[PDB]
Design an enzyme around this catalytic site. Structure first.
Site, PDB file in Angstrom:
ATOM      1  N   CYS B 157       0.651  -1.366  -0.093  1.00  0.00           N
ATOM      2  CA  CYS B 157       0.152   0.057  -0.160  1.00  0.00           C
ATOM      3  C   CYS B 157       0.825   1.175   0.083  1.00  0.00           C
ATOM      4  O   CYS B 157       0.069   2.548  -0.308  1.00  0.00           O
ATOM      5  CB  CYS B 157      -1.109  -0.213   1.079  1.00  0.00           C
ATOM      6  SG  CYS B 157      -2.071  -1.324   1.113  1.00  0.00           S
ATOM      7  N   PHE B 208     -10.442  -4.448   0.397  1.00  0.00           N
ATOM      8  CA  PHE B 208      -9.492  -4.430  -0.700  1.00  0.00           C
ATOM      9  C   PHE B 208     -10.583  -4.529  -2.235  1.00  0.00           C
ATOM     10  O   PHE B 208     -11.405  -5.167  -2.004  1.00  0.00           O
ATOM     11  CB  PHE B 208      -8.681  -5.764  -0.992  1.00  0.00           C
ATOM     12  CG  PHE B 208      -7.435  -5.668   0.128  1.00  0.00           C
ATOM     13  CD1 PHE B 208      -6.696  -4.222   0.368  1.00  0.00           C
ATOM     14  CD2 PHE B 208      -7.231  -6.465   0.837  1.00  0.00           C
ATOM     15  CE1 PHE B 208      -5.746  -4.349   1.112  1.00  0.00           C
ATOM     16  CE2 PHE B 208      -6.017  -6.631   1.673  1.00  0.00           C
ATOM     17  CZ  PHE B 208      -5.251  -5.397   1.971  1.00  0.00           C
ATOM     18  N   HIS B 302      -3.354   7.573   1.748  1.00  0.00           N
ATOM     19  CA  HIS B 302      -3.585   6.369   1.482  1.00  0.00           C
ATOM     20  C   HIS B 302      -4.664   5.818   2.475  1.00  0.00           C
ATOM     21  O   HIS B 302      -4.380   5.743   3.662  1.00  0.00           O
ATOM     22  CB  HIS B 302      -2.374   5.196   1.492  1.00  0.00           C
ATOM     23  CG  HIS B 302      -3.059   3.735   1.178  1.00  0.00           C
ATOM     24  ND1 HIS B 302      -3.428   3.378   0.113  1.00  0.00           N
ATOM     25  CD2 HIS B 302      -3.101   2.956   2.321  1.00  0.00           C
ATOM     26  CE1 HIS B 302      -3.933   2.213   0.260  1.00  0.00           C
ATOM     27  NE2 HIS B 302      -3.472   1.929   1.391  1.00  0.00           N
ATOM     28  N   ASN B 335      -9.836   0.028  -0.570  1.00  0.00           N
ATOM     29  CA  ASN B 335      -8.497   0.100  -0.734  1.00  0.00           C
ATOM     30  C   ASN B 335      -7.862  -0.791  -1.869  1.00  0.00           C
ATOM     31  O   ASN B 335      -8.032  -1.972  -1.899  1.00  0.00           O
ATOM     32  CB  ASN B 335      -7.981  -0.453   0.509  1.00  0.00           C
ATOM     33  CG  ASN B 335      -6.622  -0.548   0.725  1.00  0.00           C
ATOM     34  OD1 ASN B 335      -5.690  -0.237  -0.280  1.00  0.00           O
ATOM     35  ND2 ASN B 335      -6.014  -0.892   2.089  1.00  0.00           N
TER      36      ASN B 335
HETATM   37  C1  LIG Z   1     -11.639  -2.957  10.256  1.00  0.00           C
HETATM   38  C2  LIG Z   1     -12.272  -1.637  10.492  1.00  0.00           C
HETATM   39  C3  LIG Z   1     -12.561  -0.744   9.204  1.00  0.00           C
HETATM   40  C4  LIG Z   1     -13.610  -1.661  11.149  1.00  0.00           C
HETATM   41  O1  LIG Z   1     -13.299  -1.758  12.436  1.00  0.00           O
HETATM   42  P1  LIG Z   1     -13.866  -0.651  13.564  1.00  0.00           P
HETATM   43  O2  LIG Z   1     -14.563   0.502  12.847  1.00  0.00           O
HETATM   44  O3  LIG Z   1     -12.774  -0.227  14.525  1.00  0.00           O
HETATM   45  O4  LIG Z   1     -14.909  -1.675  14.327  1.00  0.00           O
HETATM   46  P2  LIG Z   1     -15.043  -2.574  15.341  1.00  0.00           P
HETATM   47  O5  LIG Z   1     -14.046  -2.183  16.198  1.00  0.00           O
HETATM   48  O6  LIG Z   1     -16.246  -3.136  15.691  1.00  0.00           O
HETATM   49  O7  LIG Z   1     -14.467  -3.736  14.817  1.00  0.00           O
HETATM   50  C5  LIG Z   1     -15.085  -4.741  14.223  1.00  0.00           C
HETATM   51  C6  LIG Z   1     -14.485  -6.128  14.134  1.00  0.00           C
HETATM   52  O8  LIG Z   1     -13.262  -6.066  13.484  1.00  0.00           O
HETATM   53  C7  LIG Z   1     -12.306  -6.900  14.155  1.00  0.00           C
HETATM   54  N1  LIG Z   1     -11.002  -6.546  13.548  1.00  0.00           N
HETATM   55  C8  LIG Z   1     -10.618  -5.194  13.332  1.00  0.00           C
HETATM   56  N2  LIG Z   1      -9.369  -5.231  12.939  1.00  0.00           N
HETATM   57  C9  LIG Z   1      -8.926  -6.407  13.099  1.00  0.00           C
HETATM   58  C10 LIG Z   1      -7.624  -7.265  12.718  1.00  0.00           C
HETATM   59  N3  LIG Z   1      -6.615  -6.565  12.198  1.00  0.00           N
HETATM   60  N4  LIG Z   1      -7.623  -8.503  12.806  1.00  0.00           N
HETATM   61  C11 LIG Z   1      -8.781  -8.975  13.321  1.00  0.00           C
HETATM   62  N5  LIG Z   1      -9.948  -8.642  13.761  1.00  0.00           N
HETATM   63  C12 LIG Z   1     -10.076  -7.157  13.392  1.00  0.00           C
HETATM   64  C13 LIG Z   1     -12.709  -6.318  15.569  1.00  0.00           C
HETATM   65  O9  LIG Z   1     -11.976  -7.340  16.531  1.00  0.00           O
HETATM   66  C14 LIG Z   1     -13.905  -6.445  15.566  1.00  0.00           C
HETATM   67  O10 LIG Z   1     -14.338  -7.911  15.586  1.00  0.00           O
HETATM   68  P3  LIG Z   1     -15.877  -8.120  16.811  1.00  0.00           P
HETATM   69  O11 LIG Z   1     -16.828  -7.353  16.448  1.00  0.00           O
HETATM   70  O12 LIG Z   1     -15.919  -9.435  16.728  1.00  0.00           O
HETATM   71  O13 LIG Z   1     -15.160  -7.719  18.094  1.00  0.00           O
HETATM   72  C15 LIG Z   1     -11.324  -0.617  11.195  1.00  0.00           C
HETATM   73  O14 LIG Z   1     -10.837  -1.463  12.410  1.00  0.00           O
HETATM   74  C16 LIG Z   1     -10.172  -0.228  10.369  1.00  0.00           C
HETATM   75  O15 LIG Z   1     -10.314   0.589   9.587  1.00  0.00           O
HETATM   76  N6  LIG Z   1      -8.774  -0.799  10.840  1.00  0.00           N
HETATM   77  C17 LIG Z   1      -7.624  -0.554   9.987  1.00  0.00           C
HETATM   78  C18 LIG Z   1      -7.605  -1.312   8.827  1.00  0.00           C
HETATM   79  C19 LIG Z   1      -6.116  -1.599   8.231  1.00  0.00           C
HETATM   80  O16 LIG Z   1      -5.162  -1.541   9.231  1.00  0.00           O
HETATM   81  N7  LIG Z   1      -5.905  -1.403   6.950  1.00  0.00           N
HETATM   82  C20 LIG Z   1      -4.503  -1.442   6.727  1.00  0.00           C
HETATM   83  C21 LIG Z   1      -4.241  -1.830   5.210  1.00  0.00           C
HETATM   84  S1  LIG Z   1      -3.086  -3.221   4.844  1.00  0.00           S
HETATM   85  O1  LIG Z   2      -2.393  -9.181   0.964  1.00  0.00           O
HETATM   86  C1  LIG Z   2      -2.084  -8.115   0.293  1.00  0.00           C
HETATM   87  C2  LIG Z   2      -3.187  -7.854  -1.032  1.00  0.00           C
HETATM   88  C3  LIG Z   2      -2.957  -6.700  -1.639  1.00  0.00           C
HETATM   89  C4  LIG Z   2      -4.056  -6.147  -2.785  1.00  0.00           C
HETATM   90  C5  LIG Z   2      -4.923  -5.432  -2.365  1.00  0.00           C
HETATM   91  C6  LIG Z   2      -5.714  -4.883  -3.568  1.00  0.00           C
HETATM   92  C7  LIG Z   2      -5.837  -5.383  -4.844  1.00  0.00           C
HETATM   93  O2  LIG Z   2      -6.557  -5.050  -5.869  1.00  0.00           O
HETATM   94  C8  LIG Z   2      -4.855  -6.339  -4.937  1.00  0.00           C
HETATM   95  C9  LIG Z   2      -3.886  -6.859  -4.114  1.00  0.00           C
HETATM   96  O3  LIG Z   2      -2.373  -5.604  -1.079  1.00  0.00           O
HETATM   97  C10 LIG Z   2      -1.816  -5.688   0.089  1.00  0.00           C
HETATM   98  C11 LIG Z   2      -1.052  -4.673   0.448  1.00  0.00           C
HETATM   99  C12 LIG Z   2       0.052  -4.628   1.766  1.00  0.00           C
HETATM  100  O4  LIG Z   2       0.283  -3.600   2.362  1.00  0.00           O
HETATM  101  C13 LIG Z   2       0.018  -5.953   2.241  1.00  0.00           C
HETATM  102  C14 LIG Z   2      -0.775  -7.252   1.882  1.00  0.00           C
HETATM  103  O5  LIG Z   2      -0.588  -8.646   2.336  1.00  0.00           O
HETATM  104  C15 LIG Z   2      -1.439  -7.150   0.628  1.00  0.00           C
END
Ligand SMILES: CC(C)(COP(=O)(O)OP(=O)(O)OC[C@H]1O[C@@H](n2cnc3c(N)ncnc32)[C@H](O)[C@@H]1OP(=O)(O)O)[C@@H](O)C(=O)NCCC(=O)NCCS
Ligand SMILES: O=C1C[C@@H](c2ccc(O)cc2)Oc2cc(O)cc(O)c21
Ligand SMILES: CC(C)(COP(=O)(O)OP(=O)(O)OC[C@H]1O[C@@H](n2cnc3c(N)ncnc32)[C@H](O)[C@@H]1OP(=O)(O)O)[C@@H](O)C(=O)NCCC(=O)NCCS
Ligand SMILES: O=C1C[C@@H](c2ccc(O)cc2)Oc2cc(O)cc(O)c21
Lengths: 389, 389
Positions: B157, B208, B302, B335
């Site tokens: 990302c 995603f 992002h 995303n």
């Molecule tokens: C996932 C998300 C969109 C929604 O969660 P939220 O708005 O915080 O709402 P909640 O706290 O109710 O989360 C919902 C559930 O997601 C789960 N969850 C969130 N992040 C998680 C993770 N990384 N692994 C596992 N479970 C996860 C929580 O444990 C919860 O489960 P539950 O309802 O059974 O307790 C938010 O946590 C988020 O945007 N996180 C960041 C995502 C991220 O790191 N992306 C980076 C890209 S590589």
């Molecule tokens: O697990 C993959 C999936 C991926 C992905 C997203 C959207 C798409 O269209 C194609 C691939 O991007 C990622 C980005 C990360 O930082 C770590 C990861 O592990 C991944």
């Protein structure tokens, strides 16, 4: 403006290399390889492989894989077994580790503290991961957490040219930039048992070896403090005509596969002349000095195999000593994919100082570094040597 | 010298985008995904996924994978089945194809013939091959056979920042250089059935999406002929502290796997302030204009997930409209890994012209593009907008 640029040409300020300690001599390889892969009953196929090794112009190679490791991991000894996860577990760790050995030697020669490294380029054909080998090497070395990293994965044999083409712009466009450039290759990603239906994979088992090389590249070396060995002056890249599918490699569940057409030497040797004449015409334009002759350049040529070197030497009319440093590295290390041309650069400067020649390029002023790989891709770098003492 | 350099700042001269035509609305995704993966009996796991989708701030995504394709390929519908070869067969073809659609739109806007492209950077997280997606895209477009190519594989990302950091140096250090920059991502590499032992993979299934974006980047736009939209002025990269293993992705025999710790938003939001203050201090040093306030910059962030945006906005005290263009793209596309920030750049300039604001950055002069990914890696680009009419 907001980021000041450098002034002089990007220069190689130090070179380090590293290889796995296990050496296999080519005279032993046919029996070693058909024994460890349980293929000795395939006598005809083996005799074909003996002839490939006899003609390889490779005397010995360094290999991470040993008899012990192979007997411990039978899936690597078959020809087509699911084995990618196992291979990755190996090279995701060992490729950065070997790169670290080469990088530490380069930094020691350079003589400046490692925190002055501002950029890192890591090139490999051996494994992929996130975060990548660049991240892993930065961790192993303890580079600054703000080093600007780039990982070039699945490059193949032209990658030694590619890293110089990119490093040139990073060094020249960033005042003070010092670029650590690492190529690291380990054949565990591709090693497999023999099959008489895929005879081009056999060629790789005769030629491919393991190794890593590292450069410090920067512009404006500090006088009496840093030392330039070569200058990067011009770069070019070309897809050769009618070469679709000449060299292919796919990352499959059985690991990295290798496909290689018998006409690769002909494609390279028949097109390289026009490419070099064009490159030299750009560096020495008329409007003015004519370009040096081929025999008055120094040559750092990726030794994809002896047939490539022989046909290039024949088609360009090169004197028999022009490719001596190239052939020495092939003889002692095999084809180490992207790392190979940097080993040759190191061999050339070391011979030049040893023999007290007048420049780091065997006494010549201008030179050529050539990488060849999938595309069929030709990477051309016009280099200048540095005067010695 | 032998290769003349450019003078002005590397500039974005055109942007194109493309997405698979199949749209899945987030309200339908939980039933679509647990049905097609034969997991509806796992009611608790599904209710957990419903809550993730309800909180995702994603209204719809474009997906190459359709019900038809998935029912034709059952190994993609399980959670842990050998499927890498199948996935690769798909994305090695479809990722360059989608990139080609975005690149053709960018070239059409740019208005110059495609042969004036001198360099190509292709970035993806979706598949690997030799020759690579860069070669394939060059073939699809009919670029000059001598285009200088670079393929950035397994980036993740942060890659949208990385491609700008590299393109800046290619454009600025090469007079006349015009760099085609493509990010293309297709989730077929990572899609898999649900498991209540790997709940972080569930998050990826909620967030995603697929998409590709393309730029033309060059210095010294020809007056009245080419048109700059943003200028690249400063770049930085950082590995955030205590983030080992925050975001990992491995290319396995079951395809691309995803590992994601719950503290990713906290790590990003708690460290980004020091990073931006340092970057802005480098761009606006004292010896002199003070840096603009956060609220007077434009923001291309992002959107790794809504929790990242919400916590960054909270920790930096951003006014609620600063991330509006970012959140619009997350809402309408999900995303899209490395491509996402370039979609946001396009959305921002298009809103700015539409609403007749005074610059391409919502009426602000300076702005920030931020990529976050495995490392945990933070890519920072300080941008300048261009005045409108
Ligand atoms: C996932 C998300 C969109 C929604 O969660 P939220 O708005 O915080 O709402 P909640 O706290 O109710 O989360 C919902 C559930 O997601 C789960 N969850 C969130 N992040 C998680 C993770 N990384 N692994 C596992 N479970 C996860 C929580 O444990 C919860 O489960 P539950 O309802 O059974 O307790 C938010 O946590 C988020 O945007 N996180 C960041 C995502 C991220 O790191 N992306 C980076 C890209 S590589
Ligand atoms: O697990 C993959 C999936 C991926 C992905 C997203 C959207 C798409 O269209 C194609 C691939 O991007 C990622 C980005 C990360 O930082 C770590 C990861 O592990 C991944
Ligand atoms: C392999 C090589 C070192 C030895 O071959 P040589 O010196 O020409 O000798 P020969 O012509 O006797 O070749 C020996 C055998 O190799 C076989 N062979 C050579 N190249 C082959 C290929 N690409 N695929 C399959 N078999 C091949 C020949 O068919 C011959 O088999 P045979 O004895 O059963 O007829 C030489 O051909 C070479 O260097 N080729 C270039 C290697 C290359 O392309 N590497 C690029 C790196 S990706
Ligand atoms: O099949 C692989 C193996 C590889 C490799 C060589 C040496 C080493 O130590 C590690 C990997 O390089 C390659 C280079 C190519 O152009 C095409 C390829 O298919 C390959």
């Amino acid at each position: 403006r907001k980021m000041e640029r450098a002034e002089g040409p990007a220069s190689v300020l130090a070179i380090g290399t590293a290889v796995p300690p296990n050496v296999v001599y080519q005279k032993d390889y046919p029996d070693f390889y058909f024994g460890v892969t349980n293929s000795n009953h395939k006598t005809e196929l083996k005799d074909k492989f003996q002839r490939m090794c006899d003609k390889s112009c490779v005397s010995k190679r360094h290999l991470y894989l040993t008899e012990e490791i192979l007997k411990a991991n039978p899936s690597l000894c078959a020809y087509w077994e699911p084995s990618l996860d196992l291979r990755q577990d190996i090279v995701v760790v060992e490729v950065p580790k070997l790169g670290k050995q080469a990088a530490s030697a380069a930094i020691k020669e350079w003589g400046q503290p490692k925190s002055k490294i501002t950029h890192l380029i890591f090139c490999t054909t051996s494994g992929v991961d996130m975060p990548g080998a660049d991240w892993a090497l930065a961790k192993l070395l303890g580079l600054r957490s703000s080093v600007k990293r780039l990982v070039l994965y699945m490059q193949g044999c032209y990658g030694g040219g590619t890293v110089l083409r990119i490093a040139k712009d990073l060094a020249e466009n960033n005042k003070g930039a010092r670029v650590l450039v690492v190529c690291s290759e380990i054949t565990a990603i591709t090693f497999r048992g023999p099959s008489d239906t895929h005879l081009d994979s056999l060629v790789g088992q005769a030629l491919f070896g393991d190794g890593a090389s590292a450069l410090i590249v920067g512009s404006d070396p500090v006088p009496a403090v840093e030392r330039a060995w070569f200058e990067l002056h011009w770069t070019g890249s070309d897809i050769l005509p009618n070469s679709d599918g000449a060299i292919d490699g796919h990352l499959k569940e059985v690991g990295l596969t290798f496909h290689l057409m018998k006409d690769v030497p002909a494609i390279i040797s028949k097109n390289i002349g026009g490419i070099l004449k064009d490159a030299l015409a750009k560096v020495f334009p008329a409007a003015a000095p004519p370009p040096p002759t081929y025999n008055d350049l120094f040559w750092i040529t990726h030794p994809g195999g002896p047939a490539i070197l022989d046909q290039v030497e024949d088609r360009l009319g090169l004197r028999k000593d022009k490719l001596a440093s190239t052939r020495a590295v092939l003889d002692q290390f095999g084809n180490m994919s992207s790392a190979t041309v940097l080993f040759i650069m190191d061999e050339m400067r070391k011979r030049s100082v040893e023999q007290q020649l007048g420049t780091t390029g065997e006494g010549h002023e201008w030179g050529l570094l050539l990488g060849f790989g999938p595309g069929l891709t030709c990477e051309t770098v016009v280099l200048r040597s540095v005067p010695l003492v």
